């Protein structure tokens with residue numbers, strides 16, 4: 001056929017939402033079984049929405065309604081469409097409408113980074129906005145390279161970048177980002193390798209922070225002796 | 226309207242679900258039951274094969290009073306299959322089944338604790354190491370909790386590879402933190418009695434087990450050897466189903482229930498009691 | 514638990530003489546030989562049946578070097594092991610599905626390799642310190 | 657399971673252990689007590705300090721038991737039947753402690769026999785110690 005229009009429903013904008021494919025004259029969703037960032041990457045390039053920020057499968061975008069076209073897909077990342085992987089059969093599935101898979105793309109994402117509860121505007125507890133919610137970052141795997149990327153992304157003197165929130169208390173909400181692995185050259189914090197958004201093995205005590213400075217305001221002395 | 230229920234369940238009725246008087250049966254108001262052994266993400270204990278995907282929903286973690294983790298197998302939405310030696314842990318040989326039930330703690334799924342209404346042992350549990358566990362209420366079947374189906378055939382034919390999940394001890398003799406499984410092939414029966422007893426003839430049988438204790442070997446049990454990587458089942462794996470995947474209809478069948486888990490890696494074969502032998506007894510027990 | 518300064522000093526002193534290019538490969542080969550189910554994850558490393566094939570495998574030696582480098586990285590950050598091993602634990606749990614007990618088995622095999630290499634210098638105190646180290650590494654690399 | 661080659665390697669390794677078996681077992685017990693203090697709960701009547709005469713005697717007994725097991729590698733359950741009953745019922749030693757002691761014995765053999773602790777011999781000795789532990793932990797309940 002080669003005329004399968006694909007849309008994203010109930011996700012705020014066009015590039016984010018629940019995947020939905022029209023085949024045989026009817027609109028159908030996709031199961032989240034064996035759904036990873038590779039499948040999310042394919043969907044994002046289908047709509048020309050850029051790279052894949054993350055994927056969702058717990059029907060957070062909303063309950064679906066229709067014939068679930070795809071159940072299990074084997075996508076390595078480089079596909080011309082979602083209907084090119086080993087979809088194990090068309091229409092056949094073992095899901096319900098609660099297992100439908102969504103995707104958030106770069107073009108439609110409102111990703112942002114901010115610093116809150118710090119001594120200055122360049123330091124504090126690092127917070128990121130996924131799906132328009134402000135969440136924190138776990139400090140596991142958070143190193144100076146991630147601090148350098150965060151300092152450059154936010155924008156202020158980044159000559160000296162230090163991890164660890166300054167006097168900042170535990171964050172509240174979600175821990176969107178964990179085990180960030182930046183090499184120091186990424187434009188922002190979400191282009192680095194990390195865990196799936198929202199999935200983590202941390203608590204809000206381990207909330208990651210950053211200390212951006214030009215080196216003029218770092219003083220160290222010995223007291224009491 | 227038509228009566229239909231959610232996933233992992235099949236309608237249990239006579240004629241469709243269109244109704245409130247039904248033109249087929251009247252006012253039956255059917256209730257739909259669970260699904261035989263169709264895991265959401267099927268698979269494909271000293272050894273590895275970490276059950277990362279939750280490929281064995283039927284496996285249940287049974288802990289005794291003195292904290293010896295053992296295994297159980299969901300056979301239907303409310304009952305489970307285990308071994309009589311597992312239920313008699315921390316109990317006298319004369320202890321009945323009435324006081325065993327409050328002792329046990331059962332976990333299905335991730336850690337979903339389920340209350341045990343009653344426990345019934347096999348009448349000949351000295352020869353057929355089987356005990357049945359009944360829950361207080363039917364468990365909620367999902368991608369992590371789902372009964373295995375009792376086979377209609379005998380899949381214990383030599384050479385058949387079944388997957389043995391387990392919550393028992395590992396290569397460090399530590400009770401495994403995560404559920405594991407192995408792909409043990411059923412071995413020749415004569416080689417198994419010959420391995421444990423003397424010569425498969427009653428007048429020449431001797432306690433020849435490479436491990437201290439002797440398994441219960443009879444016509445109701447088969448044996449599965451170690452896998453290709455010399456991995457087997459260890460203490461606490463008893464009661465776990467010898468799950469066999471029938472490729473024809475894509476259904477998982479409890480071909481056997483692991484009875485002799487003391488074959489960690491020394492004895493070459495683990496002894497599994499045939500479910501088909503006990504299938505008639507368990508079905509009669511489900512009725513009452 | 515926090516590691517005492519004497520135990521830390523003993524661990525560091527014993528690790529200073531550890532051949533990074535060979536000890537890790539020896540430990541990985543011993544793990545694949547003693548526990549053959551660990552060869553399941555290295556089916557792409559070539560022949561692994563004979564123990565001599567396992568120990569002489571160049572890919573096994575390279576991966577043992579990488580594993581021992583990861584051990585050194587966790588040693589330099591003994592007080593922060595979960596943070597340093599988050600990415601490796603995620604890799605092993607999701608991409609590789611390595612059972613956590615394999616990490617404890619490899620830690621024990623590495624302790625055996627260290628004892629084999631250092632003779633009587635691997636005293637029961639430094640062995641206790643290294644057991645604490647490998648237990649921390651395995652726990653940080655698990656779940 | 658112990659292959660004939662594994663049995664040969666175990667017999668050779670324990671033969672070259674020889675008369676040093678008593679102090680090998682004492683060192684293994686000390687290593688188990690230090691590395692894994694949870695195994696000390698099974699010895700509340702022992703003096704568990706370094707160089708203890710009581711720990712040395714118990715290590716000698718353990719090594720004599722291992723020598724008997726090596727000599728009866730084809731009939732280990734019968735050789736260790738008394739010890740199996742003892743550990744499983746009277747002392748109720750949990751099998752994880754048996755694996756810890758096996759690991760400590762392997763560490764002692766590696767530290768004292770580095771030339772003869774080849775990966776094949778190491779695997780064979782690990783298999784033999786696993787067999788000993790399984791025989792001793794079989795009757796545990």
Ligand code: HEM
Nearest residue numbers: 551554555579580583584601609611615616617619620654
């Ligand atoms: C116990 C401590 C261990 C440490 C510190 C460790 C460390 C590492 C490191 C540094 C890598 C490379 C990561 C990469 O290339 O991206 C890796 C990958 C890997 N590990 Fe481990 N490892 C350990 C245990 C194990 C065990 C016990 C097994 C198997 C039984 C195992 C199996 C693997 C495999 C299969 C890979 C990927 C091989 C490849 O990329 O070609 N690891 N590990």
Ligand code: HEM
Nearest residue numbers: 695698699717718721722739743747749753754757788789
């Ligand atoms: C390869 C493993 C082991 C061997 C060969 C072994 C062997 C022995 C032997 C020969 C005895 C002397 C019993 C007698 O003379 O009546 C003994 C006693 C004992 N064993 Fe073990 N054993 C092993 C493992 C363990 C472990 C791991 C523990 C504890 C963590 C343990 C705890 C004890 C205790 C408490 C006694 C009583 C000693 C006394 O009361 O003085 N055994 N064992």
Ligand SMILES: *[C@@H]1O[C@H](CO)[C@@H](O[C@@H]2O[C@H](CO)[C@@H](O)[C@H](O)[C@H]2NC(C)=O)[C@H](O)[C@H]1NC(C)=O
Nearest residue numbers: 116117118119120121123124166167168169170
């Ligand atoms: C961390 O320190 C900064 C700087 O002292 C704190 O920010 C000040 O907070 C007080 C209230 O306690 C305000 O009156 C000031 O106007 C703040 N100054 C700036 C520059 O923000 C911050 O509250 C501290 N964070 C904590 C204690 O969690």
Ligand SMILES: *[C@@H]1O[C@H](CO)[C@@H](O[C@@H]2O[C@H](CO)[C@@H](O)[C@H](O)[C@H]2NC(C)=O)[C@H](O)[C@H]1NC(C)=O
Nearest residue numbers: 289290291292313314315316317318320748797
């Ligand atoms: C069930 O387990 C408990 C705890 O392991 C056993 O209670 C112990 O029994 C031994 C031997 O009689 C005593 O030395 C301990 O002091 C008891 N511990 C307690 C009561 O906390 C109990 O005997 C076991 N039941 C059996 C074996 O039937």
Ligand SMILES: *[C@@H]1O[C@H](CO)[C@@H](O)[C@H](O)[C@H]1NC(C)=O
Nearest residue numbers: 288289290291292293315330
């Ligand atoms: C079993 O473990 C529980 C905690 O999980 C503990 O409260 C109980 O005392 C233990 N029982 C025995 C007999 O050790």
Ligand SMILES: *[C@@H]1O[C@H](CO)[C@@H](O)[C@H](O)[C@H]1NC(C)=O
Nearest residue numbers: 347348349502503505506507
């Ligand atoms: C127990 O054994 C007797 C005879 O050995 C047999 O008739 C009976 O059916 C057995 N019990 C069950 C539940 O099958």
Ligand SMILES: [Ca+2]
Nearest residue numbers: 032033057099
């Ligand atoms: Ca799903």
Ligand SMILES: [Ca+2]
Nearest residue numbers: 033071072094
């Ligand atoms: Ca599916």
Ligand SMILES: [Ca+2]
Nearest residue numbers: 139140206596
């Ligand atoms: Ca942390």
